[PDB]
Symmetry: C3
């Protein structure tokens, strides 16, 4: 898919998590986020289309999705163990990565 | 190792997983599959030898391996906790990732 | 960051792990190693500056950090289980990835 729909998926499944009731709900939301953050890593954002694929920005752009993916991995295991409040707090720390990427490349 | 060898390692250890006697067997095969799926990401597939390494096709190629590695991560954790038939069930689902990539790039 | 600083983060935290007593230290050192190996992945080492970003050596350089990241993953899960010494044993095998890369690209 393209960047905006992947971003949609991230944002909407982030909303599920923040209001989610049970571990199951968080786990399936984080599973869809992980899929969207992977798909998104193959995209060239409008701000860097005229920048090289091997430029420091594209690498840092792609790097940011590696950070997000690993943070989603952490939240996901906590949700799998049932620690629902602990996975949500971790989703809360996720948002800093989101906002850090927008500041730079959106 | 080139693509074909990495594919052979994946094929073999999937077969080990489905005929596996114990969680330990599942765990060692999925580890081999993790190493192979990471190694295969370095290659250009024959169907794309004449495409840019920055083309949408090559990104989706490599992306296919990120999906597989994470599916392997999930099955790996299931086998690490002894859920031998839960790792088998999920190993069944990652076959879909194999077939989809073959359909597109083999 | 630049490679040399990320390498310092890897080396210093690897020490913490080898001398640490409780899982909490190992866990937080492995998390800093995760970020370092992820950020180092952006770099181009002095040995390969004469080489295509798409060269086999460069793919193999970045592959090396994917292996390291995934070995950190397993070590980290062992620390999170409070298995401090199991985690230290896996850090001992992590080192082989460091030296191999050094031998090839440093
Ligand atoms: C870089 C690595 C990013 C990370 C990490 C996250 N986002 Fe993102 N976001 C990014 C870009 C480059 C853009 C703009 C792309 C474009 O084509 O306009 C966005 C945009 C969004 C949007 C807007 C959707 C739209 O219709 O324009 C949303 C709702 C959004 N981002 C959400 C979001 C969330 C919830 C994230 C973390 C969980 C997140 N983004 C991370 C780049 C990056
Ligand atoms: C793309 C992202 C792939 C995924 C995921 C998987 N495979 Fe694959 N496979 C792919 C290509 C491009 C090729 C052709 C390689 C070539 O050089 O011709 C293959 C090939 C195979 C083979 C044949 C190997 C041989 O001896 O020629 C096998 C047995 C195979 N693939 C198995 C396999 C399995 C079991 C997978 C998931 C567990 C899997 N592949 C994923 C591309 C991709
Ligand atoms: C490639 C995939 C590497 C892996 C894996 C590891 N290291 Fe590394 N290291 C690498 C390079 C290319 C270099 C040279 C960097 C430069 O610009 O000079 C290094 C260097 C180091 C250093 C020296 C840092 C300095 O002050 O010059 C240290 C202390 C170091 N590396 C440690 C280290 C450890 C502990 C690793 C595993 C835990 C490891 N490295 C992995 C490339 C690669
Ligand atoms: Cl890209
Ligand atoms: Cl999980
Ligand atoms: Cl491995
Ligand atoms: Cl990619
Ligand atoms: Cl991190
Ligand atoms: Cl790579
Ligand atoms: Na970033
Ligand atoms: Na063959
Ligand atoms: Na061969
Ligand atoms: Na199909
Ligand atoms: Na790099
Ligand atoms: Ni894990």
């Amino acid at each position: 898919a393209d960047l905006e729909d992947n971003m949609e998926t991230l944002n909407d499944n982030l909303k599920v998590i923040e209001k989610a009731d049970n571990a199951a709900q968080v786990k399936d939301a984080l599973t869809k986020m992980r899929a969207a953050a992977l798909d998104a890593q193959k995209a060239t954002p409008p701000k860097l289309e005229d920048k090289s694929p091997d430029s420091p920005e594209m690498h840092d752009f792609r790097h940011g999705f590696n950070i997000l993916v690993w943070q989603i991995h952490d939240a996901l295991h906590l949700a799998n163990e049932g620690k629902v409040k602990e996975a949500q707090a971790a989703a809360e720390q996720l948002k800093t990565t989101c906002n850090a990427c927008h500041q730079k490349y959106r």
